Paper text:
Because of the low X-ray background and focusing of the sample, DFFN injection is also well suited for diffraction data collection of very small crystals. Cydia pomonella granulovirus (CpGV) crystals are the smallest crystals used so far for structure determination by SFX15, with an average size of 400 × 200 × 200 nm3 (and about 10,000 unit cells per crystal). Using CpGV, we further analyzed how the fraction of pulses, which show crystal diffraction (the “hit fraction”), depends on the sample flow rate and the type of sheath liquid, for a given crystal concentration.
Using pulses from X-ray free-electron lasers (XFEL) with sufficiently short duration to outrun radiation damage, the structures of biological macromolecules can be obtained from nanocrystals at room temperature. The resulting method is referred to as serial femtosecond crystallography (SFX)2. In the double-flow focusing nozzle (DFFN) that we present here, an inner liquid jet is focused by a coaxial faster outer liquid jet that is itself focused by gas as in the traditional GDVN. Our DFFN system reduces sample consumption up to eight fold compared to a GDVN, can inject crystals in their native crystallization buffers, and is suitable for time-resolved mixing experiments and future high repetition rate X-ray sources such as LCLS-II.
Author numbering:
A (entry chain A), B (entry chain A), C (entry chain A), D (entry chain A), E (entry chain A), F (entry chain A), ...: 6 to 248
The structure:
Amino acid sequence: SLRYSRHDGTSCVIDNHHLKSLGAVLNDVRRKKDRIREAEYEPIIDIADQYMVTEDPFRGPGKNVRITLFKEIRRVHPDTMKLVCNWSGKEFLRETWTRFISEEFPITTDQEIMDLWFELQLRPMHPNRCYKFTMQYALGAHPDYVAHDVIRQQDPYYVGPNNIERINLSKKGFAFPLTCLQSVYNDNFERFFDDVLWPYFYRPLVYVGTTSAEIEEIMIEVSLLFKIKEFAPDVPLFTGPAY
Amino acid sequence: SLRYSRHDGTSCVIDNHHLKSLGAVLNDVRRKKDRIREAEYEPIIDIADQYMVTEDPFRGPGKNVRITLFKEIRRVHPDTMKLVCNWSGKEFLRETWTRFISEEFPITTDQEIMDLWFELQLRPMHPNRCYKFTMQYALGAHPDYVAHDVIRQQDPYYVGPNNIERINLSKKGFAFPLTCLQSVYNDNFERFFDDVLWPYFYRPLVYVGTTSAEIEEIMIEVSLLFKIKEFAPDVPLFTGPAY
Amino acid sequence: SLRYSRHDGTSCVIDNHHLKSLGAVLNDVRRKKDRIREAEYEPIIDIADQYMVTEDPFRGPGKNVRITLFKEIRRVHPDTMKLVCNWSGKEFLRETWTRFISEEFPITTDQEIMDLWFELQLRPMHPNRCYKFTMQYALGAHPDYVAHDVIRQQDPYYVGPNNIERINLSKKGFAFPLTCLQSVYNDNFERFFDDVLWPYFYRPLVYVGTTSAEIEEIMIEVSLLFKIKEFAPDVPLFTGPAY
Amino acid sequence: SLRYSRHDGTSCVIDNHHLKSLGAVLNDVRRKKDRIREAEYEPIIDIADQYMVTEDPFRGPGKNVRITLFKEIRRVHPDTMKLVCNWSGKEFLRETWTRFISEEFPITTDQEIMDLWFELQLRPMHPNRCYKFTMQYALGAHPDYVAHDVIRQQDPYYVGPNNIERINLSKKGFAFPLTCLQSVYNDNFERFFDDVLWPYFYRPLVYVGTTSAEIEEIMIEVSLLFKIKEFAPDVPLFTGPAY
Amino acid sequence: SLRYSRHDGTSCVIDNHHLKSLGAVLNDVRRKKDRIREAEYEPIIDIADQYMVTEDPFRGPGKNVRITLFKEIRRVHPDTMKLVCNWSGKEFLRETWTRFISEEFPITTDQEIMDLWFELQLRPMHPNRCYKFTMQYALGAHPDYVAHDVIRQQDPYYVGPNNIERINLSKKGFAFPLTCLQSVYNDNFERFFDDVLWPYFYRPLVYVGTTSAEIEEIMIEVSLLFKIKEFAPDVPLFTGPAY
Amino acid sequence: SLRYSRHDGTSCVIDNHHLKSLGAVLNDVRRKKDRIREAEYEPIIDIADQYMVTEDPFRGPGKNVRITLFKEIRRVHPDTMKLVCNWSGKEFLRETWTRFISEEFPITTDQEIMDLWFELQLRPMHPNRCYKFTMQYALGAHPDYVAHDVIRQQDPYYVGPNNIERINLSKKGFAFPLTCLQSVYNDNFERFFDDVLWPYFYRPLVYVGTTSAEIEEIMIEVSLLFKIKEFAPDVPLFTGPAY
Amino acid sequence: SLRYSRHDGTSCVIDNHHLKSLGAVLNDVRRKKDRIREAEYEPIIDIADQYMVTEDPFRGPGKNVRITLFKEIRRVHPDTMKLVCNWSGKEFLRETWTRFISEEFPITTDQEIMDLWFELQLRPMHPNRCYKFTMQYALGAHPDYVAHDVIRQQDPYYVGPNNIERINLSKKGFAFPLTCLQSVYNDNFERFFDDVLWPYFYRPLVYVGTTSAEIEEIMIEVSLLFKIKEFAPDVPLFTGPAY
Amino acid sequence: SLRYSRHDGTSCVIDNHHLKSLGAVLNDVRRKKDRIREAEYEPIIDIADQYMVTEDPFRGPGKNVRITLFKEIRRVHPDTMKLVCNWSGKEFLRETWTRFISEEFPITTDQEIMDLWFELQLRPMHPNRCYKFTMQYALGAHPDYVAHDVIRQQDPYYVGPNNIERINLSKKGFAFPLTCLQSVYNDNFERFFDDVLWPYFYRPLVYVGTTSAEIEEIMIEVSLLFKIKEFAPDVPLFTGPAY
């Protein structure tokens, strides 16, 4: 933050003649030099504007609601990964519906869930170590298929710089307690579960490993991150009766 | 554009001895210096080629057909947004089908609609103002759910530099008058409407606001932008009878 | 002039996710880098804003009226200067009043003469010469003092780059046909002359030389440059009778 | 100073073919590169040519005549200033007229005093000190008003880098022994004094201090600096009788 | 091209004091900085002025007269070259004398042929190819020696950037229709041929190839380029009788 | 050598949308920046293309045949030079003809000797010395003029960086065993010698010295370097009878 | 010139441990950095070593003997050139032989004239002019052909930076008083003239002009510049009898 | 390493004229530019040559003999250090004398031990850790003073980058098996021990720790490093009898 907001200097008049601050005039000269530079490179920006980048979903539009679920410790051998969660489809839907509804109610505004994200957050439990985290996942399997508790690493997802991976769970597969833009109605888990077509097939199965050449002890925080658009009218709240 | 196409200079022969332009030889020396620079940074480009960017859909493959729909003026209070359109699902499909078919017919070539985009284009109606535009949208709701005409802003989409937002309307939800790669058949709105499964559920509901601390008057142009691949054969058009 | 007015690129939305042009995002990054640079040097501009520069009176406020008077050729020896004009006070006031009034009438607006300038404009009369111009002047002397037609140079005024010197003639000494902010009245040279206190004392006596080591032939255009503020009301001109 | 005056190299002809020095050709190439740079920045110079700076009166037109008056030592406490001179108006005019006339006579040429400057020149009298000089002045007061010999500092004039302040004494207030462009006549102090309207009102009263946090011993040289334009004709001096 | 010819800014005089444009003063400062740079590198230019370069004969002194002779197409295998011309000495002299004399007559001025050049000009006949041209030549052989129509490439002349090779044909070997500085006399091919000592020995035999790894189709324009100095007097042409 | 041949990155298509490697897109942006730089300096290259440089005859067209002649040791005093060879014209022609013919025969291809060069190659015979070599030569003199075996240095030729001087021996003066483009005939030294007009006048007389301030011991290799163009047809060699 | 010859610093030994000057160690580090730079650019120098430049004949091998001939003044109209000399072949040979022999005798050493140059040296005769010089020449013509005293300019030779053109006069055409490497014999102009085959055909005819748009007065110094190799033995001169 | 040893390019002579490689001439120009830079900074090197740095004793004069003694593992708590060795003075002298003599014998040359160093070399025993090593030492104490096996860290020596600390053991305190420059005599530990004045007082007591916030397992190699000057004559070794 600068102190003058580019309003540096002033002006005055002596004998019809106009004086202006030297620093301000030098800025005018330097801004003309820069302006010429902008036009010189504008053709180069047009070549770059042939392509686009994507806005961070968590720093971007919509609000973040982090429904934390549980914590867990794992010790992982080198070149392996351990399973983080092994819920069935039903148990996953119970935690999803139950934790979101009981945290957010009363839901007083029309809104829509933009995206549902599975958040895997990792931190070391010893100091003076240097390694990075790795991840692998699946999202569906035979209800009587029980996943390996440990696997060897092969072409995993390298966890990002802040030690957080967020995995999108698309509305096609994973059911949301709020489907579209809607007001809430009277609802319960039983009618929610009954309206899910394949309740036992879809569940997140996530593994975690490291790039370390020794065993490492990992602390894990798992959460569901909801992106939500609210449509709150521009009206007052009154105590009844209104007016 | 340069005048010589890097064919600067020439050569000649005097007494078996070869002469070449000094400027051209200096370019050869500088190109060798640059070529060495390319190889020095090639390992750095490999680190950048681990990731990819996306090509502008409107400057990229396919042609653009802008079916403009209507214009509208709105005055928006600070920290609020006003609804742009409130059509039902049926009225949206009538405008979509009717305006595209009557603008494009006769459709003389096999083709496919790649993408359907809702275009929101905004321009100020007073000069000497400095603010940016914001946007929020929904795409589905109860047919008897009527949207708020004005809402307070919360985590909106910031409109891009040229004051244009284009919102993709995926084939899953919004019905296209041309589904796949096909030739046109005899068609009408009634049979089109009858084959849409959920005609009354999906409609774009878009809001617009500003980053200004005062009321601002906005002019709005709404359009449907179609991306289209044509498959025109490499054959002549003759007056009948051919040959 | 640049083609996009810093509105480079655009934005669009695919599956709730926001895309923006790569060139525009890189400009945002570079503008942040520059903005940090501005704040780093703002303390330096404050040291420069302790002092001020003066605006060019001829490119600055007020309009320019160039009442050209006469032309003249002179041949000047090295290290000398020749007199340009030798009018008495009365003859100078006749040219001043007569030429300005007959050029500007009808004077239809309230106005004030800000400054009166004596303009000496010089151009070579042979090609392929390289030298600069020099100048010296006086403004008053005994009416029976007749000035030397030629003098040796000593510490002269070096004429500026465009070969124009403009010498201010302050209202204290030299009388203006329009003293202050006023509408014109019925006027003539005789009543103007009668109201000048010292009509025979003040007259510009200007010399011109060169930095050349040989005789040079100079063409001279002399003019009076008036700086004028007009106070024209924001009202229409009608043909009488009005309304 | 360079040794070749940009006439570096030479040329010769062998078998109709023209050879030229390599160093000279490289200068031609570099001068073209610079010339392109000049044109690229010419628009920036136009923004700077909206304003003007003022030429040093003492390095610029006119000659300098330094009529030194007296020397003085003062010891000044921190945050104070001591009076340098306390002459009445008459005593100041006696020194001004007497010292200039007796130093310059015989005045053999027509001339005019452009400006009269009061010069205050300061030097330390101990080594290994680090401080700057400050100044304050007045120019008129009741003849029976006697100035304070010492004052506290408040918003003083900071003396320039070379430890010299020169204060203009305008012809309106302070009388010159040579009013305009004139030849000298028989003159004396009594008729000069009689023609000064307010001889006892105008006199320079100048104070001097420092930026030091300890007492400092200052040596002072006071002078009157005259700027003078001479109008010496381009004619010989002969022993009489001429020709 | 710049707009002010380094006459940027101006000057004026207010109360004896000289003002000059800020942009012009900054140029004076920057020119002093550059001038110091010139002197710093002048010793380096002296080391480069130990050697010389040669002026382009075709951009340099003398005028160019391009007597085009014929055009030709060739298909050249990789690593080979095809003969361009196979004239005998007599046939070459007939084309040389005949084409120059009939193109240039009437030759109305005293002049001398500085140099005679064989011009080989090459252009591709397919687009979207990338290769360069090569050349080899001989100038004399037994009159009954008939040259190979195709040869393998070995250490050829690499054609210059603009696809033009010009081969000097020295006056010792190849006869000129105008030997020295002369006016034309009545002349014909028979007396020209009779005065050539070895008319059948000297003829240009030129080959052309490529750097391509495939057959390429080449279009060829062959010409004789004369360099000519004219000595036209500074006199008028009149209709007879003169005066 | 770089690993990708500027084919860095790739592309793919997801949901009609085109993705391209980030590193490749950044190269496109940087190449546009460079391309703009090329056009900015193209006017400067045109000033340099007014002149030309000469191609190294030994790295350039034609093949090199180094007919080494003899070796020699000399001790040279400071500021002096010793004669390298003192052959008469006849003895020089015997070595020239004899050594070239017996080394090159059988000469199976039509060819022409472009240039004949006298090669003087020098190397120190003590380590840990620092000096350069110098050279002087003559090419003709009275047959009974015997050259000084040692001379003082005055304005000599400074030998090049690699300690090799090559002196052209023009066909005018020094006779070649192969005059023009020709096939070989039955030949011998006696008929070769008989056809040389001035066999005893032309012989290379070369001196060698140093820039050292002490005696230095020099090893010398002398050779004749022939530049040769071959005209080998594009035909097979068969064992007879052919076909 | 530097003061230490890169022998900066020293060394000493304290308790077996070696100390060395910090400045010297930093030079060792910087020299390693530079040495790495040399190797990085060595591949670029190899591309430049494909071509060669030519050493200034007058700053290079051989000594210069400037036999000045005459001086001359000319006034030249714009776009014209005036003849400098109009001697016949015989008169040119008389000046050449006579002036060289009488200036150089006694010629006490074996020597050879490397080159003969016609030197045209030009200087302005007015100050404060800015123009360059131009040149054109011929070398042979009919003895009864008398050249135009003035011609219009067309594609002239632009004189070099130092206002000197030197035109080579090859031994083929122009006869030298010393043909080869030789001792002098008894000689005279008559036997010299008798042995010149074409004494009346070859003579330098040189014109001079300017790039000025006005008449200019030129001073001309003409000279013959001889390049000479001496072969002075390393022997003493004694007074006779020797030893 | 570069390929040409700064002998880039060559030279040749054509028609008395000297040609030299362009790349070599450009190096000459750049070397002159650098040489000017050296002289510009030579005054700055003189300011740095007021001070000196010390040569690495182990990369510098003398040879290194590393008498390794033992290896050891320690586990060290954070902010603590463990004792590495606890020998008495006698046991230290036994290892010193015994290990050096039995490793080096036969000692066939006159020599002197310059310095004796205690080498502490440290390496981690787990991967993927990030910490540095610390050290503290004493050299003498009461023979019946037994040192603490572990201490808390306070202002320790930070081990160097390569994880090696070498501690000088001065000849005053610690006895050497070879005192000065000497040949070996018949010697044994008992007479060596008897001639040490204070055999039980001086012994190295060294501690080791880390900068880690967790326990770390360290592997330790301890050695005595001898610096030795040999004085081997320049004479042959023969089998007896010699000659």
